[PDB]
Design an enzyme around this catalytic site. Structure first.
Site, mmCIF file in Angstrom:
data_model
loop_
_atom_site.group_PDB
_atom_site.id
_atom_site.type_symbol
_atom_site.label_atom_id
_atom_site.label_comp_id
_atom_site.label_asym_id
_atom_site.label_seq_id
_atom_site.Cartn_x
_atom_site.Cartn_y
_atom_site.Cartn_z
ATOM 1 N N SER A 159 -11.020 3.023 9.303
ATOM 2 C CA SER A 159 -11.124 4.469 9.348
ATOM 3 C C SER A 159 -12.612 4.810 9.522
ATOM 4 O O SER A 159 -13.464 3.933 9.293
ATOM 5 C CB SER A 159 -10.658 5.022 7.998
ATOM 6 O OG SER A 159 -10.898 6.407 7.853
ATOM 7 N N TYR A 172 -10.335 5.205 -1.779
ATOM 8 C CA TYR A 172 -9.884 4.963 -0.414
ATOM 9 C C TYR A 172 -11.054 4.586 0.487
ATOM 10 O O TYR A 172 -10.946 3.628 1.251
ATOM 11 C CB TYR A 172 -9.152 6.193 0.114
ATOM 12 C CG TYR A 172 -8.774 6.106 1.567
ATOM 13 C CD1 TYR A 172 -7.616 5.454 1.966
ATOM 14 C CD2 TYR A 172 -9.545 6.723 2.543
ATOM 15 C CE1 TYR A 172 -7.244 5.400 3.301
ATOM 16 C CE2 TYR A 172 -9.190 6.665 3.883
ATOM 17 C CZ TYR A 172 -8.031 6.010 4.256
ATOM 18 O OH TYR A 172 -7.666 5.967 5.578
ATOM 19 N N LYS A 176 -11.741 1.126 2.499
ATOM 20 C CA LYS A 176 -11.956 1.156 3.950
ATOM 21 C C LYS A 176 -13.279 0.503 4.330
ATOM 22 O O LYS A 176 -13.354 -0.163 5.357
ATOM 23 C CB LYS A 176 -11.807 2.578 4.508
ATOM 24 C CG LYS A 176 -10.360 3.052 4.574
ATOM 25 C CD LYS A 176 -9.500 2.128 5.437
ATOM 26 C CE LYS A 176 -8.041 2.412 5.229
ATOM 27 N NZ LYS A 176 -7.193 1.875 6.337
HETATM 28 N N1 LIG Z 1 -4.004 9.277 9.427
HETATM 29 C C1 LIG Z 1 -5.328 9.313 9.350
HETATM 30 O O1 LIG Z 1 -5.962 10.368 9.335
HETATM 31 C C2 LIG Z 1 -6.071 8.007 9.358
HETATM 32 C C3 LIG Z 1 -7.378 7.960 9.819
HETATM 33 C C4 LIG Z 1 -8.039 6.748 9.905
HETATM 34 C C5 LIG Z 1 -7.397 5.602 9.515
HETATM 35 N N2 LIG Z 1 -6.129 5.662 9.065
HETATM 36 C C6 LIG Z 1 -5.454 4.374 8.681
HETATM 37 O O2 LIG Z 1 -4.436 4.093 9.605
HETATM 38 C C7 LIG Z 1 -3.377 3.363 8.945
HETATM 39 C C8 LIG Z 1 -2.052 4.013 9.240
HETATM 40 O O3 LIG Z 1 -2.122 5.403 8.860
HETATM 41 P P1 LIG Z 1 -1.046 6.447 9.388
HETATM 42 O O4 LIG Z 1 -1.694 7.774 9.480
HETATM 43 O O5 LIG Z 1 -0.418 5.840 10.588
HETATM 44 O O6 LIG Z 1 -0.015 6.437 8.162
HETATM 45 P P2 LIG Z 1 1.526 6.818 7.954
HETATM 46 O O7 LIG Z 1 1.682 7.519 6.660
HETATM 47 O O8 LIG Z 1 2.017 7.448 9.200
HETATM 48 O O9 LIG Z 1 2.206 5.366 7.932
HETATM 49 C C9 LIG Z 1 1.603 4.235 7.265
HETATM 50 C C10 LIG Z 1 2.712 3.230 7.106
HETATM 51 O O10 LIG Z 1 2.307 2.172 6.201
HETATM 52 C C11 LIG Z 1 3.425 1.851 5.403
HETATM 53 N N3 LIG Z 1 2.995 1.178 4.182
HETATM 54 C C12 LIG Z 1 2.458 1.760 3.065
HETATM 55 N N4 LIG Z 1 2.344 0.948 2.041
HETATM 56 C C13 LIG Z 1 2.841 -0.256 2.518
HETATM 57 C C14 LIG Z 1 3.038 -1.513 1.911
HETATM 58 N N5 LIG Z 1 2.682 -1.806 0.655
HETATM 59 N N6 LIG Z 1 3.598 -2.490 2.661
HETATM 60 C C15 LIG Z 1 3.927 -2.225 3.927
HETATM 61 N N7 LIG Z 1 3.788 -1.082 4.603
HETATM 62 C C16 LIG Z 1 3.242 -0.129 3.838
HETATM 63 C C17 LIG Z 1 4.127 3.171 5.162
HETATM 64 O O11 LIG Z 1 5.473 2.911 4.790
HETATM 65 C C18 LIG Z 1 4.000 3.834 6.536
HETATM 66 O O12 LIG Z 1 5.110 3.575 7.385
HETATM 67 C C19 LIG Z 1 -3.770 3.289 7.464
HETATM 68 O O13 LIG Z 1 -4.418 2.055 7.195
HETATM 69 C C20 LIG Z 1 -4.768 4.437 7.315
HETATM 70 O O14 LIG Z 1 -5.678 4.224 6.244
HETATM 71 C C21 LIG Z 1 -5.466 6.826 8.973
HETATM 72 O O1 LIG Z 2 -9.011 7.831 6.895
HETATM 73 C C1 LIG Z 2 -8.438 8.975 6.655
HETATM 74 O O2 LIG Z 2 -7.294 9.075 6.237
HETATM 75 C C2 LIG Z 2 -9.284 10.163 6.938
HETATM 76 C C3 LIG Z 2 -9.166 11.293 6.132
HETATM 77 C C4 LIG Z 2 -9.948 12.409 6.353
HETATM 78 C C5 LIG Z 2 -10.875 12.419 7.387
HETATM 79 N N1 LIG Z 2 -11.736 13.541 7.570
HETATM 80 S S1 LIG Z 2 -12.517 13.966 8.942
HETATM 81 O O3 LIG Z 2 -11.669 13.672 10.055
HETATM 82 O O4 LIG Z 2 -12.947 15.314 8.727
HETATM 83 C C6 LIG Z 2 -13.951 12.950 9.090
HETATM 84 C C7 LIG Z 2 -14.607 12.885 10.307
HETATM 85 C C8 LIG Z 2 -15.777 12.161 10.409
HETATM 86 C C9 LIG Z 2 -16.278 11.496 9.309
HETATM 87 CL CL1 LIG Z 2 -17.811 10.691 9.453
HETATM 88 C C10 LIG Z 2 -15.585 11.517 8.105
HETATM 89 CL CL2 LIG Z 2 -16.121 10.562 6.754
HETATM 90 C C11 LIG Z 2 -14.423 12.258 7.982
HETATM 91 C C12 LIG Z 2 -11.002 11.308 8.210
HETATM 92 C C13 LIG Z 2 -10.214 10.221 7.965
HETATM 93 F F1 LIG Z 2 -10.378 9.152 8.760
#
Ligand SMILES: NC(=O)c1ccc[n+]([C@@H]2O[C@H](COP(=O)([O-])OP(=O)(O)OC[C@H]3O[C@@H](n4cnc5c(N)ncnc54)[C@H](O)[C@@H]3O)[C@@H](O)[C@H]2O)c1
Ligand SMILES: O=C(O)c1ccc(NS(=O)(=O)c2ccc(Cl)c(Cl)c2)cc1F
Ligand SMILES: NC(=O)c1ccc[n+]([C@@H]2O[C@H](COP(=O)([O-])OP(=O)(O)OC[C@H]3O[C@@H](n4cnc5c(N)ncnc54)[C@H](O)[C@@H]3O)[C@@H](O)[C@H]2O)c1
Ligand SMILES: O=C(O)c1ccc(NS(=O)(=O)c2ccc(Cl)c(Cl)c2)cc1F
Lengths: 258, 245
Positions: A159, A172, A176
Site C-alpha cells: 500500500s 496497519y 504495510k
Molecule cells: N482498498 C484499498 O484502499 C487498499 C489500498 C492499498 C492496498 N490495499 C491492500 O490490497 C489488499 C486487498 O485489499 P482489497 O481492497 O482488495 O480488499 P477486500 O476487502 O476487497 O478483499 C480482501 C480479501 O482478503 C480476504 N482475506 C482477509 N483475511 C484473510 C485471511 N486471513 N485469509 C485469507 N484471505 C483473507 C478477504 O476475505 C477478502 O476477500 C490488502 O492487502 C490491502 O491492504 C488496499
Molecule cells: O492501504 C489502504 O487501505 C489505504 C487507506 C487509506 C488511504 N488514504 S489516501 O488514499 O488518502 C493516501 C494517499 C497517499 C498517501 Cl501518501 C497516503 Cl499515506 C494515503 C490509502 C490507502 F492506501
C-alpha cells in the site's frame, strides 16, 4: 500532471518488454473480492492456471466461476492466510492437486481503523499475522520449487501506507511497512544468492474503492479494475515497485526533502 | 553552528529503557544517568540490567530494574502496573530491546520469525499503549523507537529482521502523524537508525563500524533536540536518498 505526460512519453520511446504468464500456476490470496478478484480475472485472460485462496468460500468460488467463463483452469481453497498451520497443510493440497506454484500474489489483507488507544490487541495481532507473517509462511512453502527451477515471481501487495504513515491506521501502516521491507530484503537476498530467475514486485496503491476502508485518508478515486491492470502490467514487465497511480512516487520523494 | 537546535532538559524525567542490559540500551542508560533522569531499566537478562544500574547509580542517578520479556504482552502489562506503583508515570520511553536470527529465508525457523516480530515491533505496541495514556493526560512525553538502517533498506540473510525494522519505522511515522492529527503537541517522537554497531548483536557488518558509546551520544543528542529521524552516522541519509534515484 508533469510526470503523467512525461511517463506516457517514456512508455512509447522506451517500452519495457512484456513476458508471457500463459500456463504458469498463479496463487492469489484474498481472491474472494476486490484487488485479489480482479487480479485473478487479469491472469485468467493471460491464460494462466489459477489457484485461489480466501477465508470467504462463497466469494472465492464466485471469482473462480468468472475466471472459468474467461477460459481459465481454476482450483479454489478455503485458507486462513494468517494461520501458519492452515497455510502449510494447504500447500500440501495444492502440490497434490495442481502442482508447483510459479507466481505467488500475497494480496490478503486486514485493517481495523482506530486511534492507538482505541485498538484491540487481538486486532493488532491479526493485522500482523495476515498482512506480513502470512507472506513469510506462504513464501517459505512455495520458494523451494521456484529455486529448484530458477523460475518464479513473488508479488507483495502492500500500500502507499508501506511508505508513509496515516493517522488512525498505525498497526496497519506498520504491517504495510513490514511488507515493503520483506519485498526489498527478498529482492536483495535472491540476487546475493545468484538466483536470477525469481522476480519480485510490490504493489503500492493509494485508496481503492473496494470497501476495505470507508473513505481515503486525504483530499484525494481508484477503481479495482485499474489497480488490477496496473498490477498485471507491472508483473509482465518485471517492475519491482508498482505505485498506483505511478505519479505517487514523486510525492514520496518530495517527502524525503523537507 | 549557524542554525543550532535548542537542547531541552530531561532532569527528573522518568525514563524507561528496554534492553538496557547491554549495548545501545546500557550506554543510553548511562547518558540519561548523566542527564539527572529517574531511570527504569527493563531486560530479560537480570544480571546485565543490574550491572547497568550499578554503573548508573555510580553516575549519581536513581535507578529501578525489572526483569521483563519485552516481546510478551502479558508480562509487559503486569510490569507497567509495577512501574506505576513503585516509580510513577514514565515520561520518556526508549523502545530499544531487539532480536535477530541471521539466515537465508529457507534456513529461518518460523519461531525465530515470530520472536523477531514479537520483540522488534509488537512489543513496541504493548509498551506504548500502556505508557502513552499518562503522557496524553499530561500533554508531555517522548516515544523513542530504536529501529536500524534495516528499517529503510533491505539486507540479504536478514529478511525477517529488516521487515520488523521497517515495521518499527512505520509505527514511528504513523504515531507522529496521529499525535499531530489529535492536537497532542507535548508528546515528541524520535527514531534511531544506526548502521552496524560493534555490540555483538550480529557478528559482522553486511556491507564493506560504530562504537556503542557514539550511538548513545547520537541518540541522547537527538532526543534533547527533538529530532524525529536520527541516523548514525547522520550522513547515511544521503545514501538512502541516492538509492531512491
Ligand atoms: N482498498 C484499498 O484502499 C487498499 C489500498 C492499498 C492496498 N490495499 C491492500 O490490497 C489488499 C486487498 O485489499 P482489497 O481492497 O482488495 O480488499 P477486500 O476487502 O476487497 O478483499 C480482501 C480479501 O482478503 C480476504 N482475506 C482477509 N483475511 C484473510 C485471511 N486471513 N485469509 C485469507 N484471505 C483473507 C478477504 O476475505 C477478502 O476477500 C490488502 O492487502 C490491502 O491492504 C488496499
Ligand atoms: O492501504 C489502504 O487501505 C489505504 C487507506 C487509506 C488511504 N488514504 S489516501 O488514499 O488518502 C493516501 C494517499 C497517499 C498517501 Cl501518501 C497516503 Cl499515506 C494515503 C490509502 C490507502 F492506501
Ligand atoms: N548492533 C547493531 O548493529 C544494530 C544496528 C542498528 C540497530 N540496532 C538495534 O539496536 C537495539 C539494541 O541492539 P544492541 O546492539 O544494543 O544489542 P545487544 O545484543 O547489545 O543488547 C540488546 C538487549 O536487548 C535485550 N533483549 C532481547 N530480547 C529481549 C526481550 N524479549 N525482552 C527484553 N529485553 C530483551 C537483550 O537481553 C540485550 O541486553 C536492537 O533493537 C537492534 O535491532 C542494532
Ligand atoms: O541492525 C543491524 O544489526 C545491522 C546489521 C548489519 C548492518 N550492515 S551495514 O552496517 O553494513 C549497512 C550499511 C548501510 C545499509 Cl543501507 C545497510 Cl542496510 C546496512 C547494519 C545494521 F544496522
Amino acid at each position: 500532471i508533469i510526470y503523467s505526460y512525461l511517463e506516457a512519453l517514456v512508455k512509447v520511446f522506451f517500452p519495457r518488454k512484456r513476458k508471457s504468464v500463459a500456463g504458469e500456476i498463479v496463487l492469489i490470496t484474498g481472491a474472494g473480492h476486490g484487488i485479489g478478484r480482479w487480479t485473478a480475472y487479469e491472469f485468467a485472460k493471460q491464460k494462466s492456471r489459477l489457484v485461489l485462496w480466501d477465508i470467504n468460500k462463497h466469494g472465492v468460488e464466485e471469482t473462480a466461476a468468472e475466471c472459468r467463463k474467461l477460459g481459465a483452469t481454476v482450483h479454489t481453497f478455503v485458507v486462513d492466510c494468517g494461520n501458519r498451520e492452515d497455510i502449510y497443510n494447504s500447500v500440501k493440497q495444492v502440490k497434490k492437486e495442481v502442482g508447483d506454484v510459479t507466481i505467488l500474489v500475497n494480496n490478503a489483507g486486514t485493517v481495523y481503523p482506530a486511534d492507538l488507544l482505541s485498538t484491540k490487541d487481538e486486532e493488532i495481532t491479526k493485522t500482523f499475522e495476515i498482512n506480513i507473517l502470512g507472506h513469510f509462511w506462504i513464501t517459505k512453502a512455495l520458494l523451494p520449487s521456484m529455486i529448484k527451477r530458477n523460475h518464479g515471481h513473488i508479488v507483495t501487495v502492500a500500500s502507499v501506507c508501506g511508505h508513509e504513515g496515516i493517522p488512525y491506521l498505525i498497526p496497519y501502516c506498520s504491517s504495510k511497512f513490514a511488507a515493503v521491507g520483506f519485498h526489498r530484503a527478498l529482492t536483495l537476498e535472491l540476487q546475493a544468492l545468484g538466483i536470477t530467475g525469481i522476480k519480485t514486485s510490490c504493489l503500492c496503491p493509494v485508496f481503492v474503492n473496494t470497501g476495505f476502508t470507508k473513505n481515503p485518508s486525504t483530499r484525494l478515486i481508484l477503481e479495482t479494475d485499474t489497480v488490477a491492470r496496473s498490477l498485471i502490467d507491472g508483473i509482465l514487465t518485471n517492475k519491482k515497485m508498482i505505485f498506483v497511480p505511478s505519479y505517487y512516487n514523486i510525492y514520496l520523494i518530495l517527502d524525503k526533502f523537507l
